[PDB]
Amino acid sequence: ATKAVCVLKGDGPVQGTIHFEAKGDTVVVTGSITGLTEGDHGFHVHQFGDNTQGCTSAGPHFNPLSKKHGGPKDEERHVGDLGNVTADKNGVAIVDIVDPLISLSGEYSIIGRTMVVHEKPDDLGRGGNEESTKTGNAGSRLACGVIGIAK
Amino acid sequence: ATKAVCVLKGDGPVQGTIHFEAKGDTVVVTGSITGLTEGDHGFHVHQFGDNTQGCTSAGPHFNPLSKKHGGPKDEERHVGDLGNVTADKNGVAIVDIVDPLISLSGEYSIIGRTMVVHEKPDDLGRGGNEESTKTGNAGSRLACGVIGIAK
Numbered sequence A, B: 001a002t003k004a005v006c007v008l009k010g011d012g013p014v015q016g017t018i019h020f021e022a023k024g025d026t027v028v029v030t031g032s033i034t035g036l037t038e039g040d041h042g043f044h045v046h047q048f049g050d051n052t053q054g055c056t057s058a059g060p061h062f063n064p065l066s067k068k069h070g071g072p073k074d075e076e077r078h079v080g081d082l083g084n085v086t087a088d089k090n091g092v093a094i095v096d097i098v099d100p101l102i103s104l105s106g107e108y109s110i111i112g113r114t115m116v117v118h119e120k121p122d123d124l125g126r127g128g129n130e131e132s133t134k135t136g137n138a139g140s141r142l143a144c145g146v147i148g149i150a151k
């Protein structure tokens, strides 16, 4: 698949549509998320595309290389570590990310997994407590969706 | 994945959780769908895992082999043709299907695609008309969800 899409939904007002496209040798992520509080929000690909218990059942960050949590520019990061999206004061975050670890086919494929947007900023694994090394202290999951194959 | 899961949601009262498990060259489908009217309801895998327009953006029945619609037991069927699920008086349908055509891996995997439960029963390409060898006259799409990777 060269194109994928994710519709983010939750218990509150946060919603959004994320698009993925395999271009050249990388994946371009675009779209927008609305209803967010102004500022940064963690944005990650979680391991399972399981919504049976809301965003909880999506599990931890997609991490096939068994690394610790980090920022998207770090060597030591989870494949699902796409850092932070930034919402303006209208609560809108425009997503524009190009990432070297995720893919839409094979070992690193995020098709069938879950995209999650968090309540708080991702400290990019530099917070200094154990939690930083797992989730960047990004907190609860405001909205999520299973990543599907798009036309 | 040897396991997948799909959570069906719609605008109406229909909801459900569907489980998939690879066994041999088959996929065992289980779970249940509630909020249905008593009787049969078509149950198909649609091509795209795109919920940007509700269940409509899911596209046609997953048909990578370019065949006409049919029932699961038919040699002439779409890969996505999983027949009907039967709902009882209480509006609950327990799903139990073992299928040899759908797969959770490879070129024609259903992970990242959409499960759809229909309004009317599926005539299995035997109703006579033209909407019978395309959709089996199953009607509107009540609930759907993108098929994701499960633990």
Ligand SMILES: [Cu+2]
Pocket: A042, A043, A044, A045, A046, A061, A116, A118, A135, A138
């Ligand atoms: Cu996350």
Ligand SMILES: [Cu+2]
Pocket: B042, B043, B044, B045, B061, B116, B118, B135, B138
């Ligand atoms: Cu259908």
Ligand SMILES: [Zn+2]
Pocket: A044, A061, A068, A069, A070, A077, A078, A080, A081, A134, A135, A136
């Ligand atoms: Zn992480």
Ligand SMILES: [Zn+2]
Pocket: B044, B061, B068, B069, B070, B078, B080, B081, B134, B135
């Ligand atoms: Zn069909």
